[model samples]
Target: TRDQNGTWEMESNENFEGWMKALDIDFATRKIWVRLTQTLVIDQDGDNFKVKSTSTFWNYDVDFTVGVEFDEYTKSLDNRHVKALVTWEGDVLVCVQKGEKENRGWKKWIEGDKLYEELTCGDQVCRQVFKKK
Candidate 1:
């Protein structure tokens, strides 16, 4: 396995609640998420990738490929429909989600055996750091 092929467990979060609020997440979900230690599992094969985020109160997963657009719904996150496209900028996987909100997307990258993720919507940005598990 390479840098991005392993399971990563959440170490820290920055402005995660704010980002979730910007997406209009319900108070009940937000309450449960604030104390959650999330796990991110990423499986990559060639240009295709699968991502799963697991927590005691929530679980979400997505499958996509580099440079391909797919119909993606935010499911348990925002429950919004989006046309999602993912591409590689250098070693970072950048995703653009086109829908009701402006500047809604996420980026994922790995650094020094740690996985980093940034979720963006409007002007709100949430950063999450995970250590390899």
Candidate 2:
């Protein structure tokens, strides 16, 4: 199992607006979000994992256990509620978010000295790469 315990700084993002649009994020917020520098802090203990994402404009925090499902109320970001479940796929952390939107989820994986996140919403996917910091 891969241990996720570190800080990561965003290096790049792909199709972030498209992915946010699929979640019904407003245009003004999207415009501001695209330019912000983001950081992610991850702490893992056994099967439990805690994650916090921070930026100049917003912050998001959520914690979950592998294979367990919980209600997640996304604040500042989408302002929506979803049932979030996380599981491991090889060395990757695969998360499935069930809510109003179809096929919404995210996947986190580590390669070399970087962390990658693939955020999916309906048919749109946003890819973010972060360097270990």
Candidate 3:
């Protein structure tokens, strides 16, 4: 509920190419997609949020309210279909994707004006940190 209402610039990212591999993203596609810079914009009002991820390769957004499960299909990003739930844990915005890959989800939090998004799949955890834009 704090410092998560604006657009952020993607600064650094960690290994989730492994996560992509687990999602079955082909090597050729993954290679090109891996180097692309992404931008995340979170429009939050109360328990409702529109999380937008923008890139040259793909732009997508997920609209959901907290504590509710909805059908979440990853169209441009891996193209997987799963049930998703968004919730608040402490000050962090957490989302869990049920079905398909095991323990697949993401978490976004603000730290020192930087936004940190950690994506998980199986045992792979990819971290993408962003700065206020």
Candidate 4:
């Protein structure tokens, strides 16, 4: 029912490369990350649809249609999986991930010209804003 505009990768001074290196992602994988383009393929037939974030290295797929429960794998990030369920609390698509790390998950929403995502891992939370190109 909606399209995401921003959805860009977040790079930091500390955890960006460190996290990827720890995941054993090869140089090729790391190289492709810079050239990687993420696209969201959203297919909605009814109340349930698949929301997919696809890239050259990894993709995140969520088959959550409204109130239904699902699992989300963060594949390239930490490889630390999660039990996730997405539901709309209005216009916001909020996802709660229950996994090895505490408060580890994301929330997504769109406002005006920007798309916003809040990603969390332990005490570190990364807020990403994407402007349409």
User: Which candidate number would show the highest TM-score if scored against the true structure?
Assistant: 2
Off by over 4 Å in 2: none
Which ranges in model 1 have alpha carbons more than 4 Å from their true place?
Answer: none
In model 2, pairs of residues that clash are: none
Q: TM-score order of candidates, best first? A: 2, 1, 3, 4
Q: Which ten residues in a row have the lowest lDDT in candidate 4?
A: 5-14
**What TM-score does each of the candidates earn?**
0.95, 0.95, 0.94, 0.61
What tens digits encode model 4's per-residue C-alpha lDDT throughout 30-133? 66664554555556555676667667667676677667666767665556667877777676777777877676566777667566666656666555555544
lDDT of 3: 0.86
Off by over 4 Å in 3: none
Local distance difference test, each candidate: 0.89, 0.90, 0.86, 0.60
- Lowest lDDT sum, 10 consecutive residues, model 3, at 16-25
Question: On a 0 to 100 scale, what is the lDDT of residue 110 in model 1?
Answer: 83
lDDT, model 2: 0.90
Superposed by TM-score, candidate 2 places the C-alpha of residue 47 at a distance from the truth, in angstroms, of: 0.9
Model 3, residue 94: what's the lDDT? 87
Better of 1 and 3 by lDDT: 1
Model 3 root mean square deviation, Cα atoms: 1.2
On residues 2-94, what C-alpha lDDT tens digit does candidate 3 reach at each position? 659888999998895877777778899888878889899989888888889988887788899899999988887878889999888998888
Cα displacement (angstroms), candidate 4, residue 108, comes to 0.8
Candidate 4 regions exceeding 4 Å error are 1-46, 72-77
